[PDB]
Amino acid sequence: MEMTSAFTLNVRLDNIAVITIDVPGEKMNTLKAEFASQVRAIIKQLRENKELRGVVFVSAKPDNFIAGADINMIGNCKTAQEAEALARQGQQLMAEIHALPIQVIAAIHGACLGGGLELALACHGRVCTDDPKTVLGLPEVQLGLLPGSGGTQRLPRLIGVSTALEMILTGKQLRAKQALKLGLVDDVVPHSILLEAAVELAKKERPSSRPLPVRERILAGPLGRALLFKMVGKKTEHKTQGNYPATERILEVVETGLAQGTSSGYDAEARAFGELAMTPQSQALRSIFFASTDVKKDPGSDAPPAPLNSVGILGGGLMGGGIAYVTACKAGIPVRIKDINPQGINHALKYSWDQLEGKVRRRHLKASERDKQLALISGTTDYRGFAHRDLIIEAVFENLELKQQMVAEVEQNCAAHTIFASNTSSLPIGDIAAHATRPEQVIGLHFFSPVEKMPLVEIIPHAGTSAQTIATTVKLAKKQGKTPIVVRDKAGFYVNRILAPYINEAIRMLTQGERVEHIDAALVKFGFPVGPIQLLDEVGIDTGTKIIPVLEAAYGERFSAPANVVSSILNDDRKGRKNGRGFYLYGQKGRKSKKQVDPAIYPLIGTQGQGRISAPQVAERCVMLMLNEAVRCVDEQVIRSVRDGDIGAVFGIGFPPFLGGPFRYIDSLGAGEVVAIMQRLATQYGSRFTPCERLVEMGARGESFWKTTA
């Protein structure tokens, strides 16, 4: 009640006390500033009474045990001093909790993330339910930070060095069974007896009388700790490219904690919040986290949705199998596939089968539920059985008349309630609708290839589209574990529209006599996962390139690629991995190592010149193209909100997260200042680097797309 906080004490008839943690506001159980104060009062009031024999912590909330520290509290920090103050106060609070002689037990149910294991690692014993919602981990390196207290030193000394550093670096998740197997949690019980199952553990005499041994004692000591740190650091820096802070700092703080003692580790971790909380990467990651949470919260539309239980797919092959797998195995909705050929249905079912049972081969699932999941996918070559489908997806070739014919015939052979969606590539949605008895129930999705890897979709209404349709589609996309984005119906849409200049300028580079390897390495070192050419070949050369004529006919010739060279590869059976031959050595005869590109692509290219351009400069030019295209499209409100565009760009293309996205990057690089040097780029190469007019105005007068708070 604004003073009770959440931590409430209750002494039962036995000489034990149960502590409930019920936050009056959010359904999560987060950590705020006043808790660290009032819990001291509670623990003092408990320390006065000598009648007790044990204490237990209870979530008292169906959702989670403790969600984690409130990031907004960190957001108000101003320098290293405040962060060090928070670190030190958390350290002393956990030390005080660990300082009691009586038995302290944590009963874990729901979720325990971030600072949560802090409390768990500050307790002598802990038990967790078997509810498949329970999970343990440290999701703080993801936010460009490190755990609050002791987790870098008490956890390694509790469970081992290798697993602890793997948890701290990757920030993975723990299940109840595997936490028990590893040794983190002492016992696992069903939820019903949970608190009771803790009580007798409180009654046990030994707080710590015989710590469990480590079968991985071999490396204990200075004989191998240095070697392991060197190897893991080299591995990470090669994998993370060394542009991610709060990675080597983790190794340093763990080393100093293990070698010079726990006090040294505490001091090092206080300093770690001292700087790492203020590095620009930290603000970028916190901001992108906020954006993702907001878009998950956002309902897409404002009308109430409609019931959704039946999903149909018109087309098989490979992509239709992908939509089927996502809709069935993930969202758990029955899915019905229609095709003209039994071979297509068989091929789609084979794809869904192959995608699954890989968990079975890794014992992550068993056939008992594998069969149950497959039970939701049905196939047919006729229209009977579609009469009650709530929603349907069209995923076959993009001939406009063919799509019109199918939409007509499905209007004829289905219910009026049913809504239609199309996995359109380039054809306009309104044009596809055209002759529709119920055009208001026609919408367009846009997946990618494949659909179980890239995590966002596109929702593309036309002029007449009832808000119920948008709401239903957004809720469906959410239920599939994807991030929906609503965009304005314009030629080329948003994502591939800004992706096209990337590959275009990449080919323009390649033709002017530069080795592809070092430009690829430079551009992935800038922060982009996966290089240009491998992305281009595996994504589908024809599929992605098919829109280039559409973009050219829509806006201008800036999208135009060098002629007779890309099409030369196109009509050469060198069509990427699906054709088995393209760019990189696809034979994989080099002992499954990094096979170099095929020693025939260069001769077929003009490749006149030398490297010429600096390694940073090529990446700078490409990203400037994406930035100019992004600002140009957001000028005409192709994207509903700036946050939507930023999250789409960073989260579907692979924009460097530590840069935060396009607009964080704009505000970072002096804004309009870069325009100056960017203008120079045009004067070196051509009109393709003309500044966007909105960009000119904002930069010249001095502005940010994000007034917001600053």
Binding site: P342, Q343, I345, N346, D371, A375, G379, R384, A387, H388
Partner: protein, 436 residues
């Protein structure tokens, strides 16, 4: 009404029959190899529900059964309900009556449904002769029970001391009758000898059955009754029955060794149905329930009958006994019966059956009825071929005949079909169908 009993419900509504379905049948090694018997039924039931407009909540009970039986999951109908997508509040149920299992399932569903307790149900059968349960010797089971109950270590060694001989070898399954030791085909050899069926009198029936079945696929008339099975390897789908061989000349398989007698064995392998794998199902529903949810009924049901005879000579005469009883219960006559059907598990036995229904003496003395039950025209008999062609999954060949017969009467535009079958143990079943 001294013999006729109507099959109406308490409210006065007849027992309508709605769609059915049939997995295409395969030999015991070609496809479905390693595929258990449960998941075939799972396939057919799941995709039968996902073919009509009925929500899954209408179905209130499903009955399957299987002859070849796996020790795990004895009540396979419950796993049919659980594994597929169905309401988990359906009263799953399993029966077993040898080769007439599907007929018994349909009869149970019909009588329970006309009792008033149910308004819609599923009845069918699945069978697989490729996952044979190969049990160990009987002696090497008491030893296992004792060693499970054995208390000290020294007792176990003294127990295995009696383990000797060839008790380790597995016991092959037996198709011979439990109480007779007759191989179910050698009870047809003596029937053929007794009623004088020539290897040329038969082996023309097999030819006329392979035809009118190859022709049936080629015409595609049986397109809407057969699924397109998809197999977990998903190498290639199975669309057509592979047992059918509607290309051989009648002078090609006249040169075959006798199977059982091997001395005077006027029956052989070609003119006898082979062991196969498959499944089939039918949706039973009262007329009122079908009407009130807007569904056209695929015919109806008129009457049925089951009969037993002594298993020591000619036990395969089940249809001969069952048919007159079914006719008298339906208030009909063999004359006014457009199209009939027979199980034809073997060449002969079926021919013997026609000869018997045509014989006045048999009905005079072995049944006590005044007159013989009538002869059957060739044209109105197994129009679309028979089990000497498709195959004989033990528990599935029931419902297949109902579906095919209803569709054929749909083409002829009326009539009263009739279906009969014989089973091991001297069990015979018959029922009369009415396609409006």
């Amino acid at each position: 009404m001294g013999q006729v009993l109507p099959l109406v419900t308490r409210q006065g509504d007849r027992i309508a029959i709605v769609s059915g379905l049939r997995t295409p049948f395969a030999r015991q090694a070609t496809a479905f190899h390693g595929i258990p018997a449960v998941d075939l039924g799972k396939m057919v039931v799941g995709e039968l529900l996902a073919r009509s407009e009925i929500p899954a909540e209408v179905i209130e009970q499903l009955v399957f059964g299987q002859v070849v039986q796996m020790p795990e999951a004895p009540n396979i109908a419950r796993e049919i309900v659980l594994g597929t997508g169905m309401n988990v509040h359906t009263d799953a149920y399993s029966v077993s009556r040898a080769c007439a299992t599907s007929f018994q399932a349909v009869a149970n569903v019909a009588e329970s449904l006309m009792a008033g307790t149910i308004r819609a149900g599923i009845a069918g059968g699945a069978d697989s002769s490729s996952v044979l349960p190969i049990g160990v010797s009987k002696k090497l089971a008491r030893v296992l029970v004792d060693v499970n109950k054995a208390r000290t270590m020294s007792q176990r060694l003294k127990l295995f001391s009696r383990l000797r001989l060839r008790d380790l070898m597995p016991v092959p399954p037996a198709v011979a009758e439990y109480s007779t030791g007759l191989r179910m085909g050698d009870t047809a050899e003596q029937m053929a000898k007794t009623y004088g069926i020539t290897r040329e009198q038969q082996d023309a029936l097999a030819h006329r059955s392979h035809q009118r079945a190859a022709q049936a696929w080629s015409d595609g008339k049986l397109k809407e009754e057969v699924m397109t099975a998809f197999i977990p390897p998903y190498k290639q789908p199975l669309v057509e029955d592979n047992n059918i061989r509607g290309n051989s000349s009648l002078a090609d398989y006249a040169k075959l060794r006798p199977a059982f007698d091997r001395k005077h064995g006027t029956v052989t392998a070609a003119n006898s149905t082979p062991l196969t794998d498959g499944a089939a199902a039918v949706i039973l529903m009262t007329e009122s329930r079908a009407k009130e949810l807007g569904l056209v009924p695929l015919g109806y049901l008129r009457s049925y009958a089951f009969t037993a005879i002594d298993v020591w000579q000619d036990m395969l005469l089940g249809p001969a006994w069952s048919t007159p009883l079914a006719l008298e219960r339906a208030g009909l006559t063999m004359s006014d019966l457009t199209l009939i059907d027979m199980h034809e598990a073997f060449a002969a036995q079926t021919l013997a059956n026609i000869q018997l229904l045509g014989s006045e003496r048999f009905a005079r003395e072995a049944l006590g009825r005044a007159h013989a039950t009538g002869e059957v025209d060739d044209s109105k008999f197994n129009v679309l071929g028979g089990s000497i062609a498709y195959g004989h999954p033990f528990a599935a060949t029931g419902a297949r005949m109902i579906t095919q017969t209803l569709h054929e009467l749909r083409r002829r535009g009326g009539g009263f079909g009739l279906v009969t079958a014989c089973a091991a143990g001297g069990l015979g079943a018959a029922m009369v169908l009415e396609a409006e």
